[PDB]
Amino acid sequence: DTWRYAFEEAMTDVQGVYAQKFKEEIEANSDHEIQLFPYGTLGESADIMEQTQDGILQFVDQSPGFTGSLIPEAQVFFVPYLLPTDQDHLARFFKESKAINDMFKPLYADQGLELLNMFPEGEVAMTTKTPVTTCSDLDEVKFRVMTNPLLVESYKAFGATPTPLPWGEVYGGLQTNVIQGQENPTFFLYSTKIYEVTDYITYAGHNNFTTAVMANKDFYDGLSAEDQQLVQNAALAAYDHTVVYQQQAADTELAKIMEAKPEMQVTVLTDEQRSCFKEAAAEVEAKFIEMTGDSGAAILKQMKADLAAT
Numbered sequence: 001d002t003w004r005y006a007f008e009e010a011m012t013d014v015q016g017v018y019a020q021k022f023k024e025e026i027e028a029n030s031d032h033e034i035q036l037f038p039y040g041t042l043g044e045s046a047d048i049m050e051q052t053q054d055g056i057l058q059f060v061d062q063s064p065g066f067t068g069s070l071i072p073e074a075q076v077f078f079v080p081y082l083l084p085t086d087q088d089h090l091a092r093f094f095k096e097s098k099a100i101n102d103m104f105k106p107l108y109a110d111q112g113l114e115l116l117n118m119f120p121e122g123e124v125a126m127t128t129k130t131p132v133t134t135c136s137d138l139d140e141v142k143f144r145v146m147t148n149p150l151l152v153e154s155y156k157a158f159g160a161t162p163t164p165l166p167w168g169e170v171y172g173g174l175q176t177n178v179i180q181g182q183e184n185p186t187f188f189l190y191s192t193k194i195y196e197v198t199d200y201i202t203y204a205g206h207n208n209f210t211t212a213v214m215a216n217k218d219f220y221d222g223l224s225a226e227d228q229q230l231v232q233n234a235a236l237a238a239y240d241h242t243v244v245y246q247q248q249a250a251d252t253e254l255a256k257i258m259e260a261k262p263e264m265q266v267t268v269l270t271d272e273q274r275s276c277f278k279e280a281a282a283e284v285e286a287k288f289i290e291m292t293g294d295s296g297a298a299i300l301k302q303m304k305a306d307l308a309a310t
């Protein structure tokens with residue numbers, strides 16, 4: 001059978017680990033067959049989302065970092081320090097969240113997409129060519145960022161000069177010094193060898209990388225009750241498998257960056273040093289309320305209640 005599936009990373013990366021477990025589970029329990037499409041085929045994240053909405057692709061992985069333009073209240077995932085750093089507590093959140101698994105679903109549906117899961121990918125880290133010790137060290141650093149308004153507002157509040165750019169241009173831009181800064185989890189910034197074109201890694205603990213897996217809603221609604229269930233089963237099985245794997249990654253990948261490039265300067269900021277960043281976190285939150293109205297306000301409240309209950 002057909003059923004095409006496209007994601008934003010390599011096969012060996014985290015979104016690939018998810019895809020491959022999803023593929024296993026579908027194929028072990030039916031006659032259906034999943035066809036995988038990693039980054040490097042079909043093009044950027046914006047491209048594959050269009051391809052999923054046009055109906056060429058059936059399943060797509062698109063991170064809220066790109067969907068913030070489409071669904072405005074997906075900007076919640078970029079309110080600094082909202083998401084906990086405790087990876088065990090974080091995994092229980094996305095699984096049992098009334099906000100993620102109930103309140104977000106009709107909003108994605110408004111754009112013709114059937115939301116399956118959201119999952120974490122790990123604590124994020126700044127890579128720059130100048131030292132970052134406080135917020136004023138970011139002053140006039142051209143910092144690449146995913147394409148959504150609030151994430152852009154975050155690095156303005158940090159003191160940097162934010163630049164929205166699709167991933168395909170990030171390595172080259174850094175190499176030719178058109179940009180001086182970038183942010184991603186540790187597994188990915190090792191995987192993409194981005195340490196070759198940056199000098200400093202900084203753990204501010206401001207965010208965890210979140211991503212989402214969805215299906216073309218028309219396609220999904222066309223399926224039988226058994227097929228729909230089969231998909232839901234495969235998504236839940238892929239989630240459980242991915243969270244275990246991505247925990248191991250964050251806990252081991254930094255050792256490999258230092259192995260391949262021993263000169264690399266890796267700073268993890270103390271709570272004392274993180275103070276100016278957490279001060280910016282409150283005014284970014286205030287900005288989020290202004291942009292998304294009372295619609296996204298109910299999402300923030302529930303998200304906080306889900307974190308507490310878990």
Ligand SMILES: CC1=N[C@H](C(=O)O)CCN1
Pocket residue numbers: 008009063121146166167184185188209
């Ligand atoms: C951590 C990650 N970064 C990519 C990016 O910065 O656009 C998206 C695929 N996954």
